[PDB]
C-alpha cells in the first residue's frame, strides 16, 4: 500500500540490536529424512531498540514517534546499519557495488535488489532507497538523468529502456521498512529535575524488519 | 592555600572547637552516569547525586568535645579552614552523622581519637566567615 | 542425493561445541534384564556453531552462506577437525592409518569408513572425503591411481578389483553433511560505526550432522 | 546372559561421580503409618562420568568405547574405587577381609559376596572379580589351587567341597557391571590445532551400576 | 619534553587559571574487545569507546576559581602542558564534568584542593596554541 | 644483557623512533588450562591461545611521533632492545593497537606521555637486526 | 643453607644453563580440603591435588638459551639450588610449561627476562646431584 | 617476652629441630557469628570453630629435616618458643598438615625453605616444658 | 470469642517483617472501566518472624510458644511496633494523640480506635490495649477513674456517660491479635555443643494480623 515513511533516528539505532530471522525449514520424519518446506519470501530481521536514546529528551522524541504511528500504522522507516552499506563498513558503497540487473531493451524498471550469497543468492528488493546514496550505473558509463526513481517503490525507471548488453548497477543505503513487534514499550528514563539523571538505554522495544506486502 | 594551622574544626552545635586536632578532611563527591549508544565514540555523562563525607583527627582526652561526640550522632560541623578571621572561607556542615570513633594508642603513642562524619541528606556549604 | 555443496569455513568452525546422541535403548523390566532395541540413526552429532566470526563483515559472509542455503536446501557441508585426521590431531593422517578392508578379487568399490571402536566398532561412512588428502594403499604398494573416488559418494572404485586377501588401506580428511536444526539464525555482530566493533563470535547456531536416510 | 566385559578406564573413572541408589520404600498413610514395600534386589549405584578424560585423545577413546557397545550392549565393566577395596582405601584388601561363607561339605561354589552393614547386612554378589586380586582362604589356611573361579560368574568352585567348620574368606577388587543411564553423551573437548587445548572433563555421561539378571 | 612549570591549566569557559596548581593529569582511554579464537593463536583488538578522565591539583583558597568549580560542574578546560607560550601543544578539553573535590589538610599542611573531572561524551582536542 | 640505552622503541610505521623514551616494556603471555580427574596427584596443563602486550614511556612533546599516535591506533612497532646495530635482537610488533595514552605532569615535572600497546591478532616476532 | 651464587638453573632437556640468571623460584603447592560439622569443634584437613609453579629471572640477551625459551614451551628443568657441586639438593623439574616471558627495560635499565613456568601435571624431584 | 633465639621449631615426629630457622609463626583463630534482631542496638556474637595455622622459615639444605618434610605431610610439631629450658612455654602441634614449601633464592641469596602448616582436626596445646 | 492472649516476645518481634495487606478491589472491564468491590473489614498486616531469636534457648522458647497454641488456637498476642505508638517512634504516645470520639451523654463505651488517613480515614478498633499505656482524656481534663477498660474488648466504659461536647481522646500501645499463616515452621538453630553455635535468624515463620470476628 502507500504505507508511512517515518524516520528512526540513527543514534537510537546505534543502541539497537540485530538478529536474523529465517524460515522455510519444516523437515520430515527424524529418521534422517528431510523435506524442505517453503514459507516463501522470508529473511526478515529482528531487532530490539531504545538503547541508543542517551538522554530523556531524546527518549521522549522516540516515544512521541511511536505514538505518532499509534501502534505501527502501516510502515515505519528504519535505518539499518548492516544494509546501509552495499560494500563494507569501512568501504564506500558504489553504484557498481550492487548489480541491479541487465537491461534487455524493454527493461525500463529495476528494483534495487540486494543479492546475498553467491551460488544460490537470495535477492532482497529494497522498499526505500536512502535519498542521495542512489547512484545508477550502466556498463558503458555511470548513468545520470532519465532514470526515474520511485522512492516508495524502490524501482528506478529508465525513460529509454537500456538495450541488451548494458549492466545496470546501483548501490544505495537501505532505509528498511520496520513494524514494531510489541505495542508495549518499557520506559527507562531516570528521573530528572532535582535528580538530573536521564537514561542512555530503554529496554524492550522490539521491532521486526517487515517485508511489506505491495 | 591558607596555613592549615588556622584551620580548625569547630563543632557548630557545641559552639566550640572539638579539640587539639591533628588533621581535617572534607570531600565532596557528585557521581555521574555515563551512557552511550553502541555506535558511539564517547559516552555522555550526567551527574546524579551529591553526597559528602569528612574525617577529623583529634587527640583523645576525657575533657574533649570530640570525646563527648559519639558514633551515630548527627551533629552539625563548622570546619574553618581559613579560621575565624575576616574573609575566611569556611565549610558549614549540617547534620553530619558520625560514622565511627577510633580510640587507639601505643605505649609510646598519645591516645588518638579519629572521628569520621558523613553529612546526612545535606551538602556542606562553603560559606565565608567575615 | 547430490545435495548442495557449501563448505562451512574452518575459521567459522573454530570454537564450536558438539553433542553425541545415540538412538538405541528401549530397555525392559526392573528385574535387571534389559533389552536393547535399536531403530538405527544412532550417534548423530549436534553442533552449536558460529564461533570465531571475529568481525561483522566476516559474520556477514557466514550470514550470506545461510542465505545461500535458504533454509538448508538439500544438505550443507561441514568440516570437522576431529574426524579430519584418520589418526590423531598431532599425528599425520596416512593411507595406512585407516584400513578400508580386504579385496576378494571382485571388490572394486570400498567405502571410506571410520571405525569407532575395537571389539564392535560402529562404522561411520564418510559421505564426503576431502580431496587431495585421499591416499590409497594396496597391500602390495601404495596406489597412485585407478581408484575412482566419488566425491559425493564417498566410494573409491578400483578399476581393477583388488585380489583375494589383499588389504586396502585408505586415509583421508573427513567432510560431513550437516543440516541446520533451526531456521532462525541468532546474530552477535557488535555494532560498528562510531563505536567500532565486530563480534568475535556469533551465538551458537544449531546445525546437526545428519546421517541421511537412504 | 553372557553379557560383555569392557573395561572403563580408571583415569576416566577418577572424574566419575558416586551416588547411592536404594529402593523398597512406598510407605502407607502419612498419619505416621508406615508400610515397607519391597522392590527386591536393590542398592544400585548412580554415577556420572567423563570428567576424568584429561585430553582430546583420551576423550576420543572413551567415545569410541561407547560406540563399541553401540548403546550399552549387554554389560559394561566399570572400575569402582569404592567397591574395589574390601578393606579400606588406606588398608590392603585380603582374602580374610571379606567372608564368603562356610563350607558345609557339599558347598563347592561360593559367589564373592560383599556384606554391607552388620546386624542385618545386605550382601552383594560380585559379577566380576578383578583378576589377580582374588585370593581364597580357608579357616585352616589360605586356599590356593582347586578353586575354580568363574570370572563372569563371580563364583569360586572348590573341586573338593570344603568340609563343615572351615570358613571360606575371599577378598577381591570389584569390577562392577555398569549400563549407561543415557544414550546421549555431551562432548567437551576444547579445540586443538593452533589452539592446542583439549579437555580434562566431559559432562553428562551418566551410568547406573547394573545388577544384571543372570 | 616540555617544562610544565610554565604550564597553565586554565578554564576554556572562564578563560582563567584555576589557581596555584601542583599537578595536571589527562588520560585518554579507549576500550577494546578481544577477538578470541579457539583453534586460533591470537586475538584481534577492536576499540569501541574513548573517554577522558583527569585530575588537576590545586591549593584550596577562598578566593580561587578552583573553589568556584564545584563537583558536578560541566566546564570546558584549556589545558596547556607547555603553558601559554606559543607553539606548546595544548589540550582543549571540552565539557569536562567535575566529579569530586577533596579539601583536606593537616594542621601543618596547607589546604589542598583535588579536583577530578571526567568527560561528558566529548573528547579533548590536542591543538597547538598559536 | 643489553645496555638498554641502546634499546629504542621505533614506530615501524613512522620509520622513526617515537621519541625521548623513558622506558620500554614487552610481555608475552600464553594462557593455559589445567585439569585433573578427581583423585589425581597433579593437574595436567596444556597451553591455550597466546597474546601479548607492551608499554612504552615517552616525554610528551608537540613534535613527537608518540604525540601523533592516538589511542585506538593499530600501529606496527619496532622495539630495538639491542638497538639497530648488527646482530642485535629486536622485537617487531605488527598492528599493535594503542590501548591508551596518558599525558600528565606536575609543575616540577616535565610532561610525560605514557603509551600502551597490545598487538592485535599477532604475536611479536623476536627478529634479529643485522 | 647453600650459597646460591654457584647455583645453576639449567635446562634438563637442553642440558645447559638458561643465561645470566638473577633469581630462581620453586614452590610446590598442595591444596587441602577442610571439613567441620556444627557438632564438631575442629576442621579436619586432607590434602588433595599438588601443583608446582616457578619463575626464573634472567638477563635478556639475543644470544640466550632463555631467549630461545618461549611461553608455551614444555621443557624440563635441571635446577640446582646449590649448583652443580655434588650432593647439593637439586630439583629435577619435569615438563615445566613456560607460561610467560617479560622483557622490560628503562633506558638506564638492563633488559631483563622474567620467565614464569607452571607444571604440566608432573612433580619436580628433589634429587641430589651426584 | 622471651628471646626468640631460644624459640626453636622442633619436629615432634622426628624428635629434632627442622634446621637453621629464620622465623617461627603460630596463629590461633576462633571464628564467631554475630546476629541481631532488626530492632537491635548491637549484635550478639557467639564463637564457633577453632582452627590454627603456622609458618616456619628455614634455610634450604640437602641435609635438613625440613627438606625431608613435604607438602601434604601431616606431621606433628613441637614449637619451643621458650626453648627446652625448664618452665618454658611451648606449643605442641598435633598432625599439622604441611600445605606448601617454597624453595627460592637469588644468586646473592641463600636458598630458602619456607614451610607452612595448618594443624588438621586439632588445636596446638600450649604446654609448658620443664 | 474469648480467644487466647499469648505474648510474642518483643526481641523476636524486633526481627520481624511487615507488609500491608489490603483488599476490596475487584475492578471491571479493562476498557478503563473500574468497579470497586467491597470485601469489608480489611487492612490486615502480614509478617514473617524468627529473625529476632538471637540464640538457641530463645528459639526454643518461641517454638514452645507455638506449641502452646497447638497451631494458633484462637488468638495470639503480637506486639506491633508500628501500631504501638499512636504518635511517632520518636514522639511519646498520649491520650490526646488518638481521638476515641465524642461522648453524647449516652456514650458509655468507646473502643480504642486508630484512625489512619484524614479525609476518608479508616478506623481500626484495637482488641488489646497494651496495659499501662492506656490513658483516657476528656476535653475538660485527662480522665482518670470511672472508665472501665475491657482489656480483651478494647472498650473503655465510663460509668457516667460523658455529656455532649467533651472529646474522648485515648492513646495506647497496640497489642495486636495475630494468627500464624502457616503451621509449618522452619528451624535454623545451628548445632551447639562442641560447635557452640546457635542462630539469630530462624526463617519462614509466617503470621497474619488477624481481625478476629467477635
Residue numbers in the entry:
A (entry chain L), C (entry chain K), D (entry chain J), I (entry chain H): 1 to 214
B (entry chain E), E (entry chain F), F (entry chain A), G (entry chain B), H (entry chain C): 1 to 130
Paper lines:
We recently characterized a novel roseophage, vB_DshS-R4C (R4C), that could infect the Dinoroseobacter shibae DFL12T, a ubiquitous group of Gram-negative α-proteobacteria of the Roseobacter clade. Here, we report the atomic capsid and in-situ structures of the tail machine of the marine siphophage, vB_DshS-R4C (R4C), which infects Roseobacter. The R4C virion, comprising 12 distinct structural protein components, has a unique five-fold vertex of the icosahedral capsid that allows genome delivery. In this study, we use cryo-electron microscopy (cryo-EM) and structure prediction to determine the atomic structure of the phage R4C capsid and the in-situ structure of the tail machinery to characterize the distinguished long rigid tail.
The distal ends of the R4C tails were re-extracted and resolved by imposing C3 symmetry, resulting in a 4.5-Å structure containing a C6 distal tail (Dit), a C3 baseplate module, and three C3 tail fibre trimers. Below the Dit is the baseplate, consisting of 3 hub proteins (vBDshSR4C_014), 3 megatron proteins (vBDshSR4C_016) and 9 fibre proteins (vBDshSR4C_017). The R4C distal tail—attaching the tail tube upward and the baseplate downward—is a C6 hexamer, as revealed by C3 reconstruction. The Dit long loop adopts an L-shaped β-hairpin belt to create a flexible surface for optimal binding of the baseplate, mediating symmetry mismatch between the C6 Dit hexamer and the C3 megatron-hub complex. The overall R4C baseplate is homologous to that of RcGTA and both comprise hub (35.5% sequence identity), megatron (39.6% sequence identity), and fibre (30.4% sequence identity) proteins. The ion-binding domain, which comprises two discrete segments, uses four conserved Cys residues to coordinate an iron-sulfur cluster, which is essential for tail assembly and phage biological activity. The megatron protein is divided into six domains: iris/penetration (1–45), adhesion-like (46–211), peripheral, carbohydrate-binding (482–629), central (904–1130) and fibre-binding domains (1131–1447). The three α1 helices from the three megatron proteins form an iris-like gate in a closed state (inner diameter, ~10 Å) that resembles that of RcGTA36; this structure aids in preventing the eruption of genomic DNA. Each of the three tripod-like trimeric fibre complexes is formed by a combination of three tail fibre monomers, in which the head (1–35), body (36–117), and foot (118–230) regions are referred to as the rod, knob, and foot domains, respectively.
